[PDB]
Amino acid sequence: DTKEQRILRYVQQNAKPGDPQSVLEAIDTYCTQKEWAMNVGDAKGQIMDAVIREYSPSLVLELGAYCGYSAVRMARLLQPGARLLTMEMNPDYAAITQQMLNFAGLQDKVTILNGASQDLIPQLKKKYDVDTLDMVFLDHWKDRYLPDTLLLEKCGLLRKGTVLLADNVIVPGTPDFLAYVRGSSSFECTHYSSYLEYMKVVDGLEKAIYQGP
Ligand SMILES: CCNc1ncnc2c1ncn2[C@@H]1O[C@H](/C=C/CNC(=O)c2cc(-c3ccc(F)cc3)cc(O)c2O)[C@@H](O)[C@H]1O
Ligand SMILES: [Cl-]
Ligand SMILES: [Mg+2]
Ligand code: NA
């Protein structure tokens, strides 16, 4: 098997079906005690939770599901009727994520879109009946944060107040994205210093609130 399969099996055997918090705890324990994996983790996850609670978004887009950690983390805090769309290009990881969400009992709140964001983003309005997004969590390949932010804007998916929340702005880093949003009048930015998942290494989240064109 793969590391991702081992994480899923650990959750299934060490969390309670339908209990998202127990699922997060199991992933975090496994990744701390057994094998590191690129989940946002609990340190930055607490910041994510605070942001989700503040904004209570009705429609969230996640770029880069991986094993479904952040999809579980966010969806557990969504209000009734709210939804999360999460894009994942790797079929094996998309299957992990779906099974993770199913175990957590969150499958009715989340849609997996098994594809690349640059192909799927232009289909959101006509195929996924999206008007505009309330929040976007960026956690895919770091050199795609800027291209996909510009594409979301082009496609009319951003509105005044849409919250972009970007992982890994320190490690591995996303220098072009960060310089761009911080320098642009179209985004009001805040930096949340934290730690790399499971490691005593500084990382951070960037919140960039879209202000209109
Ligand atoms: C092609 C762009 N569009 C995409 N659309 C949909 N899914 C995509 C896309 N890119 C990547 N994916 C998926 O997102 C995930 C990839 C995320 C990339 N993340 C990282 O590189 C990352 C890396 C680290 C890290 C930090 C320190 C290290 F020493 C080593 C690694 C930490 C993190 O928190 C990370 O998020 C995978 O599941 C992948 O298949
Ligand atoms: Cl952590
Ligand atoms: Mg990350
Ligand atoms: Na700015």
From Swiss-Prot:
Annotated residues that bind substrate are located at K142, N168, E197
One GO biological process term is:
fear response
Residues involved in Mg(2+) binding: D139, D167, N168
rRNA-binding found in the keyword field: no
Task: List GO terms (cellular component aspect).
Answer: axon; cell body; cytosol; dendrite; dendritic spine; glutamatergic synapse; membrane; postsynapse
Q: What is its EC number?
A: 2.1.1.6
Q: Topology: which residues are Extracellular?
A: 1-213
Q: Which GO terms describe its molecular function?
A: catechol O-methyltransferase activity; magnesium ion binding
| Entry note: cofactor | Binds 1 Mg(2+) ion per subunit.
Residue spans making up a coiled coil are none
The entry marks the following residues as binding S-adenosyl-L-methionine, namely: V40, E62, S70, E88, M89, G115, A116, S117, Q118, D139
Keywords assigned by UniProt?
Answer: Catecholamine metabolism, Cell membrane, Cytoplasm, Lipid metabolism, Magnesium, Membrane, Metal-binding, Methyltransferase, Neurotransmitter degradation, Phosphoprotein, S-adenosyl-L-methionine, Signal-anchor, Transferase, Transmembrane, Transmembrane helix
Please describe the post-translational modifications of this protein: The N-terminus is blocked.
**Keyword flag Signal:** no
Q: Which reaction does it catalyse?
A: a catechol + S-adenosyl-L-methionine = a guaiacol + S-adenosyl-L-homocysteine + H(+); 2-hydroxyestrone + S-adenosyl-L-methionine = 2-hydroxy-3-methoxy-estrone + S-adenosyl-L-homocysteine + H(+); 4-hydroxyestrone + S-adenosyl-L-methionine = 4-methoxyestrone + S-adenosyl-L-homocysteine + H(+); 2-hydroxyestrone + S-adenosyl-L-methionine = 2-methoxyestrone + S-adenosyl-L-homocysteine + H(+)
Q: Which cofactor does it need?
A: Mg(2+)
Q: What does this protein do?
A: Catalyzes the O-methylation, and thereby the inactivation, of catecholamine neurotransmitters and catechol hormones. Also shortens the biological half-lives of certain neuroactive drugs, like L-DOPA, alpha-methyl DOPA and isoproterenol.
Which family does the entry's similarity section mention?
A: Belongs to the class I-like SAM-binding methyltransferase superfamily. Cation-dependent O-methyltransferase family.
Q: What is this protein called?
A: Catechol O-methyltransferase
- Source organism of the structure: Rattus norvegicus (Rat)
What gene codes for this chain? Comt
